[PDB]
Each structure stands twice: as C-alpha cells, then as structure tokens.
Design a protein around this ligand. Structure first.
Ligand SMILES: NC[C@@H](O)c1ccc(O)cc1
Ligand code: VO4
Length: 425
C-alpha cells in the first residue's frame, strides 16, 4: 500500500466498513511505536478527551498543543490543559483577520523513530465518531545514524518542505520539532506537502503556499494528455459576486494545471438530515446564510455527498479532497487530501493587481502524484496502483428541490434521524 491513506472509524456502520479504518486510539497505540513526545496541531481541542486517546502508558509523556486561539478562547484552552503537567501550548500567530490555525497534524517521536500524521479531524469526540474523515500516515522514519552524512531528504522534498512549513510559525517550541525532523531520515516519503500559511506573498514566494503551491507542483511534476476537477469540502468561504471573481479564474487555473467541468461536493440539507448524526452534523458544516445569499451562483456547481463505496453516505464529510479524474472517472491525474476548505482564507487570493498572494490561515495537505510512484495516472479503486477514492463517482448533481446545508437557519418542516428539528439560536 504505497498510499497510506486511511478513513477514520465510523460508529454504527457494519464492521466490514471499518476494516481498514483508523481511530485516533489506533494511531497512538504502542504498536505504532514507543512514544516519547508528541505535537498536536489543530483548530479545536477537547483536552480531557484527547489525553484519554493516548494509551495509559503514554498519557504522561510531553504533548505540545499547537493552536490559533485568542483572548478568552485561549484562556479556556490553557485552563483545559493546566491539570495535565506534561502539556504545553503553542499559539500560532494569526496577524491577518478571519484567519484560523486549521492544520491537523501529529508529530509522534518514538524510541524507534518519528511518525508524521496529516489528517482532517479536530481533536474532539464528535469528529472521530460518525464523520467521514481522512488520514495520511507517514512511514516510521528512522533516526539518521550518529555516524553518517546524509540529508534524509526525499525526491518530493517533503522533509525540507515540512521544516519550511514549521519555520513560518516563528515559534520556539516548534524549533525543537524542526531539530527532531533534521535528525530523521524522511527519504522514503512519496507524497508532496502542500501548506498554507498566513501572509502576503510576492514574486517567487507566491509559489510556496496555497493554490499557487499546488499550481507549481502540478506544472513541474504532472504531465498533460476535458479531465474534470473535483473539489470536496465542509466549509465555504465568500467567493465573490460570480465565478470569474476567484473560483473559475485563479482557483480553477491552479487546479487544471498539468505539465473543463468543475464538480463541487458539499452536503445538501437532505444529506445532513438523514445522516447518522442528523442535523447536528450541520454544526461541523458552517456555511452561513449571510455568505450563501451573496453567491447563489456557486450552488449550481454543487453535488451531493454519496459514499456507497465506503459505506459512509450517512457519515457527513469533514474530510476535504481535490482531484483530477479522467472523463469517465476510472482514473485520476492526482489526489489531494488536506485541511483546506473552499475559501480564499485557506487557498489564497491574489492582491495588488495579481502581484501578491494573500492567505489568512494555516492549512496542510498531502498530494499524491503518480510520477512519485513511477506512473502516469492512478486507477480508481471502485470499491473502497489503484487509489482509494472514498466517495462515489461520478458525483451526483443536486436535485431541483435540494439546498446546500446552511447552518444558521432553522429546519423545522422535517425531523432528522433522531426525530429532532434544528433551530439555531
Ligand atoms: N462545532 C465547532 C465549530 O467551531 C466548527 C465547525 C466546523 C469546523 O470544521 C470546525 C469547527
Ligand atoms: O476544522 V474545520 O474544517
């Protein structure tokens, strides 16, 4: 399995659908290595729940929480953490407004080596319970023998790229992790890192982050050959007054680069209503009426969440993925799993007459390029060489009576899976 791409466990589906799936408890288990220290990057944390996901033997090892919380949100987290002496926090500078520290990553230092985990889940019970989430597991990275001269770098430059990503934080506690990464051999890594980081980027530096980073890698490491672009996410930024403002102009241009139909997958009200969670799934799909009413055009691009292939049609997506399927959807030019939702905050928007890229948030993903495995394309595994696409293809268009799930309006005409209505307020 060259991919090491996994879905999280879902409670309440048949166990066949969890066979190759992982819970955070599985990731942290002693079978994955003898833990010595860890760093947990995320957006939302429930510290009590998190500490309990580590196996008893490891609960007392150091843990760094890397977050973006400010003011009283910050104080709350520090309070959550104060009972646990082994836990330190690192507050990611968020100098631009409306930015979040959205990256989900684990750094796991063991006696045996190092593991990097990049995934889509908040560290709260509900993100790992009945949601479709994604995980990329790095190999066990051995320590570089105290005797030798080697980079430990991979053909995809993952090691240098990850260090650069960490370096942009400008944080003392991450320097220790940067130094741990220097000491390890990451050369067997076959994926590319795509990060986002808050800032205004110029000239050559445009290529370092966001959708431009993606454009750059597809230019240099893909080749050409009406292949659609698919984008799948759980939150939706304000995209402008029509598709030419950003979506179809700069965003699609990056995505169609190599060496066209745009499908966007986002849960409809009906998808949310009949899900395993019911309407409360919508708490993790924060599309607001204020944003939505300003961009009604976008919704003709929207397609339902359907995942019969992985038995997860009823497990609402909090995973985000982007890919480039062939016209019959039987193969793909590339696959990206990432924390980045469909927003400019996350992906970057062009400023000052196209000379500056503005990104508001921290995002991180991994890109699977067939060239990294010596191939031209991946075949799609039709039932979750062949890439495990976790949802159904081709994507199904919204019906005429379907609406995008919008979190802050009431749904009181029909009860959900648990016989509840939804009245936010
Ligand atoms: N329900 C928590 C709310 O803050 C939220 C909503 C969506 C996310 O992706 C993360 C957090
Ligand atoms: O954590 V958020 O998509």
């Amino acid at each position: 399995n060259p991919f090491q791409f996994y879905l999280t466990r879902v409670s309440g589906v048949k166990p066949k659908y969890n066979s190759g799936a992982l819970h955070i408890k599985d990731i942290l288990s002693p079978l994955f290595g003898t833990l010595v220290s860890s760093a947990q990057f995320n957006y939302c944390f429930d510290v009590d729940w998190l500490v309990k996901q580590y196996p008893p033997e490891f609960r007392k090892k150091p843990i760094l929480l890397v977050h973006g919380d400010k003011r009283e949100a910050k104080a709350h987290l520090h309070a959550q953490a104060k009972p646990y002496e082994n836990i330190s926090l690192c507050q990611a500078k968020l100098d631009i407004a409306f930015g979040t520290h959205h990256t989900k990553m684990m750094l796991l230092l063991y006696e045996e080596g190092l593991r990097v985990v990049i995934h889509t889940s908040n560290l709260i019970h509900a993100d790992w319970h009945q949601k479709t989430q994604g995980i990329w597991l790095s190999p066990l990275y051995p320590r570089i023998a105290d005797g030798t001269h080697k980079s430990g770098e991979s053909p995809t430059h993952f090691k240098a790229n990850l260090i650069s990503y960490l370096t942009a934080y400008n944080a003392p506690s991450l320097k220790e992790w940067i130094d741990v990464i220097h000491k390890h051999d990451l050369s067997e890594t076959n994926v590319y890192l795509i990060g986002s980081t808050p800032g205004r980027f110029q000239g050559s530096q445009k290529d370092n982050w966001g959708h431009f980073r993606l454009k750059k890698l597809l230019k240099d490491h893909a080749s050409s050959m009406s292949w659609p672009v698919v984008g799948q996410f759980s939150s939706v930024g304000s995209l402008g007054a029509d598709e030419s403002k950003w979506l179809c102009s700069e965003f699609k241009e990056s995505m169609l680069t190599l060496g066209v139909p745009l499908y966007l997958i986002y849960p409809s009200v009906e998808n949310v209503r009949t899900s395993l969670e019911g309407y409360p799934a919508g708490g993790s799909l924060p599309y607001s009426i204020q944003t939505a009413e300003k961009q009604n055009w976008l919704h003709s691009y929207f397609h339902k969440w359907s995942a019969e292939t992985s038995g997860r049609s009823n497990a609402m997506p909090h995973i985000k993925t982007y890919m480039r399927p062939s016209p019959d959807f039987s193969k793909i030019a590339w696959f990206l799993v990432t924390s980045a939702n469909l927003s400019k905050a996350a992906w970057g928007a062009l400023e000052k007459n196209g000379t500056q890229l503005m990104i508001r948030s921290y995002e991180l993903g991994v890109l699977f390029l067939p060239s990294a495995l010596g191939l031209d394309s991946f075949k799609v595994k039709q039932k979750f060489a062949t890439f495990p696409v976790p949802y159904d293809l081709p994507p199904e268009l919204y019906g005429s009576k379907d609406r995008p799930w919008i979190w802050n309006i009431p749904y009181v005409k029909a009860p959900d899976t648990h016989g509840n209505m939804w009245v936010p307020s």
